[PDB]
Paper text:
CA forms the capsid shell surrounding the viral core that protects and transports the viral genome and also interacts with host cell factors that are necessary for trafficking, nuclear entry and proviral integration. Further, we assemble particles from HML2 CArec in vitro and use single-particle cryogenic electron microscopy (cryo-EM) to determine the high-resolution structures of four different types of Fullerene shell assemblies. Our studies of HML2 CArec show that an ERV retains the ability to form capsid assemblies using the same architecture as exogenous viruses. Analysis of the shell structures reveals the intra- and inter-molecular interactions that drives CA assembly into pentamers and hexamers and their association into shells that encapsidate the retroviral genome.
The D6 particles are also capsular with fully six-fold symmetric hexamers at the poles each surrounded by a ring of six pentamers and with six equatorial hexamers with similar distortions to those observed in the D5 structure. However, a comparison of the pentamer with the D6 polar hexamer, which obeys strict six-fold symmetry, shows that although helix α1–α2–α3 packing is maintained, in hexamers, the CArec monomers are positioned at a greater radius and are rotated away from the symmetry axis, relative to pentamers. As a result, the relative tilt angle between adjacent α1 helices is reduced and helix α2 comes closer to α3 of the neighbouring monomer allowing the additional monomer to be accommodated into the hexameric ring. In the D6 hexamer, because of the expanded radius, for the CTD to maintain the interaction with the neighbouring NTD it is rotated by a further 15° and there is an accompanying 2 Å shift and tilt between α6 and α7. This results in an alternative hydrogen-bonding configuration that defines the hexamer conformation where R143 now makes an intra-monomer hydrogen bond with the side chain of Q181 on the penultimate turn of α7, D171 is hydrogen bonded with S79′ but with a shifted geometry and the K229-D90′ interaction is absent. Moreover, adaptation of hexamers to the local environment is also a feature of our other D5 and D6 capsular assemblies, where hexamers interact with each other in the equatorial belt. Again, the pentamer conformation remains invariant and the hexamer six-fold symmetry is broken by NTD domain movements, changes in the NTD–CTD linker conformation and in the intra-hexamer CTD–NTD hydrogen bonding configuration and in the CTD radial position when interacting with either a neighbouring pentamer or hexamer. In the D5 and D6 particles, further configurations are possible depending on whether pentamers and hexamers are located at poles or are equatorial and interact either longitudinally or laterally.
Residue numbers in the entry:
A (entry chain B): 1 to 5, 22 to 235
B (entry chain A): 1 to 4, 21 to 235
C (entry chain C): 1 to 5, 22 to 149, 156 to 235
D (entry chain G), E (entry chain H): 1 to 5, 22 to 236
């Protein structure tokens, strides 16, 4: 990170990388413990585009690093598209968010980065990180995920919320699809207990909270 | 190792060799955690060849050690060949880059070297470390590695970037070979999905990070 | 145990001493790891033989310590011969190299021992450590075995049961040429006999037998 | 071609069309004889895009003309992109190349081009001629070109170098892939007789020469 | 060629490359007609290694050009020895023959060479051209070529002389090998017709003239 006294760079401690690689190998890079460690490290310091590549190469398996770099590129493409239609078009070009080129390829140039580019790249890398699968499987579709019988109900909502966290871009459009896909793919006998479905939902109480409160008895 | 008007010697800690041995035993000497620890050691110190000898003794298996030593010899052969064709050819002989012979056999001899010999031997040892094979098996050719059905495409490109790092010496030759071997040797299906591509590569992008996006939902 | 412009003695720190015992019990005292770690311990500091006694006694089983002490005695007895015949004869006597006697049995006496004795005793003890403890011909490079793993196994057994370096450095390359896989055995025959500069023979056999997987 | 120094366009004689047509028919349009004829035609004269269209319609199969025109289009497509990214920018655009447009449709319009677009279209059209497919079949990929049994080395390396000439643009990328692939797809006998010489430049020569010098006598 | 009028240099015509390529295509690379035409060029002018490179690459198959370059490379490693093996050694190095290096890699450097160098490159270029193969076979050794049953004996001795023209450097041994192999590998019919005629010179006739004279009428 940097420290601004003006603006010198020091590398990571070794102890942070050690338990970072420990946690990534043990729990998988989307279990929420690592997810809340990562933004804690991100907000507790002041990161640069050179540092994220160091941490990602040091932590993930070699197969996953290409996926992380791919969704980094796909994020910065949409970011540099949306950053030109503003008023004024704010001067943050593409290459400064990747740390390459004739002016941002090394450390001593990148230590002078202003706050707005940091606030870009933090959100872009954090959006990027959760598009990384467990190293055995590929992300399926909503038509495939459907709970059977003899199985507890909230595990189904957990799996469906994980898939909808992966494959949906906007968080409001994420928030809409989940509860109706949870209703539409449940068990038969549980679904009857949810048959009110509307008008038992006042404004303010979160709707996905009430559904499990219906189906807690069936085990 | 060596600090600096006069130069005095120091050794390694016992803990750094301890977790070095632990890491090489657990993860494999080309898994990128060790590969980003080792250059973090190297670029932040001053490594005389005796300390490279200590790091080679104390960490690898018995079978890996002569595998390291042979490619050390075969690298320093070509380096002392290319040193003689310069203008003027720099007077850094063979045995200053191996630590043997009556001129460079003790620590007090080696402590008084120049920066050029250090910055040559660093690149030589780091080049030598990469072609250490895994203690399971030996490296195959290029025509052996082909993904089959029911296999994620980033795993295939991970294995292909792994095999081409050992054989081919230069870097630009690697970054020419890997995408031709990627586009050829793939599964048939998303072969089609990259068939309209090679259309363009925009500014702020490589080429290999497009195929992995285009073959994302196929497994 | 450094001078600092005066002689200053300091003990071993307790973590450095502690890790050595797990290092010995995990692999063994002639494993490559502990041997090179010991060599990197030695050349970085000044090792008064009292500290060598501490580091020896604090890291082995009692039988291995007995073997180390007796081969230390043998080595200093052999070296005090060749410390005489050179001209001028150096005054390096046996009590200076064992920490015993009326003028070498305290820390302040050994704290001013000069460099030539240190460079002698280091080559004594690292020679001593190697010897801490009968069929040969049953080594065969099998089917689909990589060649550099074969030369390591034959490097192992020839160390154990020939017990002389001037002999066993000649038996190996004779045995390395004979006992290989046949399909790469003919790939060595051009390099047979001829030698390049800057290397020995078994460094050059591995050059010509890489992609034979 | 056009000459400036009585400066007008002259249409070349019918015997040039004659031996051009025989040369493209009997040998193939990427045999080295047609290669060394075409550049000796091109450099000693001054060609307009109408002349290239005349010669290409006059001395090819219809399928060859069809394959020629489209890689000509693609060459103009790349040259237009690499035009404007120079400082100061140059006034070379698309319809100045293809011989169409309201300002470049007739012969008297395009006949008055100076010495830059002529060089650019001479750079493009020759590469497009080089990309023209053999009348036999389509250009295959690098893994079905493999020296089987009973086949000699010094035409298998040429069949390799042909496909490495078509599908890769810059020649510094062409060298290393053919130097690598000349070994990996080889028959086992030349493999065994070529692995002692792997990765050594002996004296003042390329690698392919001593490669083919090694396993000469393999035809049994 | 060079005309020597600071000198002058030119490329070839158009017609000469045309019938050169036609002759090497439709008959072979070392058929006698192409052989004497190449001797007529190689003595009637003064050639430069760049011109040899042009006349090679313009008029061979893409296969055979690598073989030409290969024996051109291995023909200079003897001249490097035998230019310093005699006393006094002449000043001819490796890079002057192949036209490469920093001192001989253009026309204006190579335009002013000396006559013994041109003679050495003429000898080594002709000896290079002789060792070129056909289209798609490999030249065998002597122990596999034999006369077939119901085969005309001059064809068999022509194939023997063609094989012995390649694999043996000196031409004096080419006399004494092929006639001794003629009686050896022949058919039993020509053997029975030839056995009284072992080694007899009547008057001024070489031995290969009489064997075909004796085994002429074989029509069974």
């Amino acid at each position: 990170p940097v420290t601004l006294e003006e603006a010198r760079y020091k590398s990571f401690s070794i102890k942070m990388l050690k338990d970072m690689k420990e946690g990534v190998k043990q729990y998988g890079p989307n279990s929420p413990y690592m997810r809340t460690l990562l933004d804690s490290i991100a907000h507790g310091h002041r990161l640069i585009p050179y540092d994220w590549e160091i941490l990602a190469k040091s932590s993930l398996s070699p197969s996953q690093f290409l996926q992380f770099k791919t969704w980094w590129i796909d994020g910065v493409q949409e970011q540099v598209r949306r950053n030109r239609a503003a008023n004024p078009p704010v001067n943050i070009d593409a290459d400064q968010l990747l740390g390459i080129g004739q002016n941002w390829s090394t450390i001593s140039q990148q230590a002078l980065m202003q706050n707005e580019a940091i606030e870009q790249v933090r959100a872009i890398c954090l959006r990027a990180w959760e598009k990384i699968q467990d190293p055995g499987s590929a992300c399926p579709s909503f038509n495939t995920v459907r709970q059977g019988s003899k199985e507890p109900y909230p595990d189904f909502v957990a799996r469906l919320q994980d898939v909808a966290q992966k494959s949906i871009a906007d968080e409001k459009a994420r928030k809409v699809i989940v509860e109706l896909m949870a209703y539409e793919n449940a068990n038969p006998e549980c679904q009857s207990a949810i048959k009110p479905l509307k008008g038992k939902v006042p404004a303010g109480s979160d709707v996905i909270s009430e559904y499990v409160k219906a189906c807690d008895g069936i085990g």
